[PDB]
């Protein structure tokens, strides 16, 4: 292994006769250059001459070679290269030539392979005096943890000073405290409606004719055109809440002028406007005024507006009134002659809908776009077809008509509704078999659901306890034969399951997923990927792959048997949000990004939802950094059930205790070694804090916003970049979870534990809270627009899946309206606690880390982690 | 005498201080018992577990459960008995009040209410109830009315932990989740909504647990989740008599003895212990509960 | 079997011989996925734990099953275990003098010795492991012999350009076995009579007549063992049956006729 | 794409690791400098 | 699987909680004991159940055979080494007496549906064959459901939790009990070697110059009972920690530092040997130690070989009390003999 060869390198080791950084160099590359000779390792002995002859790769190969020789060197010669490389850190401290690059190798090592044991106030004053201010910053950080010093404060405050990072030295600062102790006319109107409320008879007359002075004053002024729309929308809204049906016609047609306008003034940020025109319409679309005017419009207006404003139009493609049915159609004629790719997906879901007036009236469409293209939609419903049967993959038909029969039957035993569920379950079997698959299970398992068949005829027939019990044995049995290698279908091939996709290739459809502004270009699609991947979420979603034809591969999440299209709804309000953090200066300033990924309807019972690339969830991340410490994964909640034997089935007061003693007991700094550890470098840590702060901080406070909850560290995904979070099933929204039946929520946003041990020493009161206010005042900034953007999708029946006749469900939207306006003003607790925007980030960062407002939760959302 | 107690064993056991040993273990590993009541004359034995009350009987040979009562959704709380063991009523996670009775039972009458209370306590004319809530709320019922009720209100929307009422119909304390308690003063003619309020006490900062006081009004002991058992004096000079700690965890619900002089404790610490409130001292100490202990019966 | 254990070679053997009273017993063992057979006399055989591999012994297997045999094995080194297997029949018939030696078996010992078996190579040698080659082509040669002569042909062929083809070829010999008059059952007829004729003039008459004169299962499996004989050696596989069939079995002139025979049939498939 | 020719040592274990990194530094000799210094 | 029934062991636990005559409280828990032989199901199940709790609780006891009957229990309460395979080797018996039952039952429907009445008859003896059947099939997915919750884990904590239990009885009456302790002692250092192979060390080291947890309560029991006032014990205990001494004569690579340190007797390797702790801390996936014994003496380092798991004749003994004579009174009690 090793001779006795390290009688030489002493010398080399202990000098101290050397004054130049010249010689300092010298040393260095000199035992550099010796090191190889006593490594223990074969493919670093024959290495020795090459390192000799040739410099630069020992540069890199000093990383294997210094481990390689600090495990074979003894205890004895350990203290002894400890004060050698002390001194060299020490000696030299003006010039920074190479101790960054040792320092560089001493944290190397550091990670995970038994570190040093060097003073880590030493390593903290040998970055300082080498200038290496982030390896310094995380050296203070470790001694702060270590013990809290205000000198020590004062050196984070001053690192933070000169890194740029004011919100870091202000939290630290204050931990420190807390803890050791025409445009006249338009001004005009603005101070008025400040200083003097509206919703009176004067107010709203003053305003329209300051409006209308200034749209005289300046003819072409957009805020001027969008103003008095917007004033005339607040006079016909008192009017209707008051019902008149006469004043209402003197303001529809200045309204529809205005807004007409001020979209072809602007051209860009048109959704608010054109949701409203659309609602104005589809409110009064009996007033023939109202109809020449849009009518005289449409030249006024353009087709790309429209083309980005698409999604509403196809969720209204019902219509009850004949000339706004004939003005939809024509306008959706002119989207379809002006790049109808844009909507192919959303027409055949209008045409798998349930509603027979949305076929009857996109029979309409299907006839103009045959005199267009007949490929196009007969080649899309063909591909779409394979995808729907394969995201609602064969078994799980007859899988949940298994399940949610025998559940209900246990639980008050509906025959007729059993009837229901498997009549339409076994029609296909006689209409004709399809694919390889089915017949595979046909050829399998059929007798036995014959037999269940019949045994159900004889109990319609006679009414037999004895024979029905019989049924539900083999319903069992087939339960049974079908549940136990359910879990080994870990893949899915698709010559297989639907080979007509594979024949089908050289697509000249366009790739379903994210658009650009105005009409996008048409990208074709060359084939399709084969092989799909398993995830295992109670549903078994799939991994699908598309080859386009530009040459790359375009990969998505497939989900089914599920209306998911309210997250496709809340992918513009990330659009919106999006636009107004760009918008916002100081947002700008400081990078705020959300990055949405592109997700299409597929259907009414299917989807594709984006996966993020180059990245890995909060879920996964910590399975590999406790295996390789070789620890056991669930180890807290396995601590305190060894005294918690009914943990689930207790009462409120005593989960408290139980769950304190596992979070004393359990280290929780997990995340926040990992992230060093795979960090590429301290200013790439750096970086990765920064990105992982701001993001959390963002989307937590936009979640609050949008009443998003039931968030898990599956959900929850970092960047394996940058580390920016990204969620998954968004269909909890507007505080759903807390009317639902299954342990109700009291945390808004999950900030755990976790969280709070991986933020900086600032705590959850600095650079956290510091970008909560700068969120807060930007998003009170637009409190008009976004209820106008929210009032669309209240009362229509799309949207009834978290808080489940017409007046039931309009007074629940508007609870929800009211609900929400108290959610952002403050008043939703207390009616006198009028609470600003300061008292309102206190009260929400307390009362989401509370511990009782935590612990109080369905195992489901996983409240330990 | 008999001492029953139960905890995270999963196994109900009784107790005798003059062998040092426990007598009867019965198993009930199904779930976790939160609380449990010995009848007055030594009769039956019912729990509060989970969506089932059951009676036992003390002197068979470890039986399968002598009666059982559900109709429960949520988890029940406590448990209220009656001298003559007429009328048995549980508090549970809905605040429905329900009613049962020994002796061949039949279906009675069942009252629904919202705000899930805590504890309960039945006034000695066998007709009214005053249950707490966690609002800090208290809810008065009596078997005369149909729906209407009396409300009081100590704290706003604060936690309101549990309360503990005069046998001798005098003194009603109350006990909140700040450690915070209030006496309220009601004299004869107790028929009436006249609970007047007195003072306000701050007997710790934590959370506290339920509070029991003897049936001569000279006493008021509670316990809390410090390894706290604390008690103060109710009718002279109304001053703190004595403190107790030392327990290795926190200390749940504790019981009495007959002369107002003897208290028990039972804790999760694997161990019971039984003091003399005038020699603060220990008397007697339990020990073979593998898990912690959480409640505790007792009756002379 | 689906990937079995000791358990389930316990009553894969014994469910069957309480069954065939004294008829004789098929016995196919594909050790692939198994590493090498021990010299000591001992198979390989899965756990249920999928961890590692367990022994059985050849007196456990033979115990199991009963006195008729015909065993096909497919191992990497067949060969150990048949000097193992030969001196263990030995030393149990020396046994036989049965002092106190008589093991109790489900079939008497006296019909041991007449019961038949097959082995893969040579000695101690490697298996064939090319992608240019089925990756169990002995029991390809004991199950299809027509298909895989006339993929071995075409690989096999110098003519191979101007023809239509890890490279396989995807020829399809049209028909089935049964019927005469098609292709593949002609090729099946003169395969017979070719495989006969070589053996009736190279074996004994007493051995002719054992092997090839009492029972039809036999006759197949041999007939295809020479088929074996003649393409396993060709791949450095020179595999040993239970009776020494003499070196004659892959030079007996004939071979020319085969290679006449799937020269025409080859060329008048490709011509149709 | 790759700042530092450290960062592949992350993923993997320690023991395997040292055949490994000296197999992909020395791949590059087939370079003219490399293979006109070292023949 | 035949005698395991719920209701049997209920039985057996009110049995064993009162029952006068010991030799039943003897067999009862010798009836448990070998319940828990090798069986995942049937320790889940005892364990749910209370049986262990019980059986716990029986270690206080008059009479000295029910203690050394517990103490063989517990010796059988061992969770099981072959746990991933044993688990498996009884879901394939259950599926097959599952589907062969299922089978007999549609024969048996079909035999029914003779279009034969055949009143007072055979199909009037089938009926209760049937549901009887359907008994023994709803009884079959009983266990198989209770199969899958298993949790291995859960059954070394409790086995853990029972030695510490056993522990207090050490300053026991008998030879007997201590004899039964010392063969469970050596049961234990069979199945968990390696956590006595890392403990060894730091302790004779110590005794030269990690520890602190219950299992050095056990390694020190084990060093009490090599003191024993009997005969037998001392070398039956010798014995036990001659497997101890032959393993780290050598254990592979350290039996140079073992000699290293065992030169001091008369008179790298920390990082070595701490890390087999995690190797089965990891695969694990009050507390009154106390540690008092009078040492006034020190442990100087008829069968040649040593198997590990010692067997203990206890089951032979007590099976041989049923050939003495129980409805005549036995030799030296008669109304006259030698003795009388």
Known sequence: KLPVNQNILKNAWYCSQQKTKEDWQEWIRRLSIQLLKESPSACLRSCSSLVSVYYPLARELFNASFSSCWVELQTSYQEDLIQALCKALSSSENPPEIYQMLLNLVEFMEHDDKPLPIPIHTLGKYAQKCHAFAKALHYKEVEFLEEPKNSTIEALISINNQLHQTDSAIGILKHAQQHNEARCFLKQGEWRVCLQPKWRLSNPDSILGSYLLATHFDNTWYKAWHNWALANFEVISMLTSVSSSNLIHRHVIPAIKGFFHSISLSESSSLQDALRLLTLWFTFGGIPEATQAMHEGFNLIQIGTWLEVLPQLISRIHQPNQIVSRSLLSLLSDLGKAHPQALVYPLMVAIKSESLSRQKAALSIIEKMRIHSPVLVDQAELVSHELIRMAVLWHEQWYEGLDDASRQFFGEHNTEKMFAALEPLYEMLKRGPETLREISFQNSFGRDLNDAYEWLMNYKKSKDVSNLNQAWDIYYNVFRKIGKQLPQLQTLELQHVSPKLLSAHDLELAVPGTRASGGKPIVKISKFEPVFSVISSKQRPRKFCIKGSDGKDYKYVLKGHEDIRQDSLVMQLFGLVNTLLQNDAECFRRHLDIQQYPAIPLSPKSGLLGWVPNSDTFHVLIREHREAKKIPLNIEHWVMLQMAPDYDNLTLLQKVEVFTYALNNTEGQDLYKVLWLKSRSSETWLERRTTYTRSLAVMSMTGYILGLGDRHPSNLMLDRITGKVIHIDFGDCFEAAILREKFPEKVPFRLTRMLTYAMEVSGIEGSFRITCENVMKVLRDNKGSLMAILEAFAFDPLINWGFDKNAIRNARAMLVLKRITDKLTGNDIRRFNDLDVPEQVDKLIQQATSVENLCQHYIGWCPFW | ?300 | SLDPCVEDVKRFCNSLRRTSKEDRILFHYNGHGVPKPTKSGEIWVFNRGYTQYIPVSLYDLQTWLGAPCIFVYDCNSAENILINFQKFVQKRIKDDEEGNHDVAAPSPTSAYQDCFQLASCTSDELLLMSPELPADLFSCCLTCPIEISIRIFLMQSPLKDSKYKSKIPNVNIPGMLSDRRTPLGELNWIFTAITDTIAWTSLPRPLFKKLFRHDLMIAALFRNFLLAKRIMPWYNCHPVSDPELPDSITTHPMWKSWDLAMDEVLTKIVID | IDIALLMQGVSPSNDEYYPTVVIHNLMKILNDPSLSIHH | KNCFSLELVNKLCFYIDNSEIPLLRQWCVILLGLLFADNPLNRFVCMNTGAVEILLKSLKDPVPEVRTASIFALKHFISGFQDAEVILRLQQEFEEQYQQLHSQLQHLQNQSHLQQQQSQQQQQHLEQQQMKIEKQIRHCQVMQNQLEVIDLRKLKRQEIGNLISILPLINDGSSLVRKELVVYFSHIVSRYSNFFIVVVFNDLLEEIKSQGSIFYTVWKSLLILAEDPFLENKELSKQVIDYILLELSAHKELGGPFAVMEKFLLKPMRTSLAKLFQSLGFSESSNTSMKSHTSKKGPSGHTEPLQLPLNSSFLDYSREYFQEPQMKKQEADEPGSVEY
């Open chain 2, 1 to 300: 005498v008999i001492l029953v107690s139960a905890g995270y064993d999963h196994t109900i056991r009784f107790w005798e201080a003059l062998t040092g040993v426990c007598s009867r273990t019965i198993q009930h590993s199904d779930s976790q018992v939160n609380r449990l009541e010995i009848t007055n004359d030594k009769k039956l034995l019912a729990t509060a577990g989970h969506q089932n009350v059951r009676l036992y009987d003390i002197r068979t040979t470890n039986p399968n459960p002598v009666a059982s009562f559900e109709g429960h959704r949520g988890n029940v709380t406590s448990v209220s008995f009656q001298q003559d063991n007429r009328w048995m009523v549980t508090s549970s996670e809905d605040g429905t009040i329900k009613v049962w009775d020994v002796r061949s039972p039949s279906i009675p009458r069942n009252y629904k209410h919202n705000a899930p209370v805590n504890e309960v306590v039945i006034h000695p004319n066998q007709g009214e109830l005053i249950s707490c809530d966690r609002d800090g709320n208290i809810r008065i019922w009596d078997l005369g009315e149909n729906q209407c009720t009396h409300q009081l209100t100590p704290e706003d929307d604060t936690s309101l932990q549990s309360l503990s009422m005069a046998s001798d119909g005098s003194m009603l304390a109350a006990a909140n989740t700040k450690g915070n308690c209030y006496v309220w003063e009601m004299p004869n003619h107790t028929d009436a909504s006249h609970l007047k309020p007195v003072t306000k006490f701050r007997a710790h900062s934590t959370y506290i647990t339920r509070i029991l006081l003897s049936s001569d009004v000279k006493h008021l002991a509670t316990c809390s989740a410090d390894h706290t058992a604390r008690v103060w004096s109710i009718d002279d000079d109304f001053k703190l008599e004595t403190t107790l700690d030392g327990h290795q965890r926190w200390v749940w619900d504790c019981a009495f003895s007959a002369d107002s002089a003897y208290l028990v404790t039972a804790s999760s610490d694997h161990y019971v212990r039984l003091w003399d409130l005038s020699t603060r001292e220990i008397v007697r100490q339990y020990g073979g509960h593998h898990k912690g202990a959480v409640c505790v019966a007792l009756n002379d």
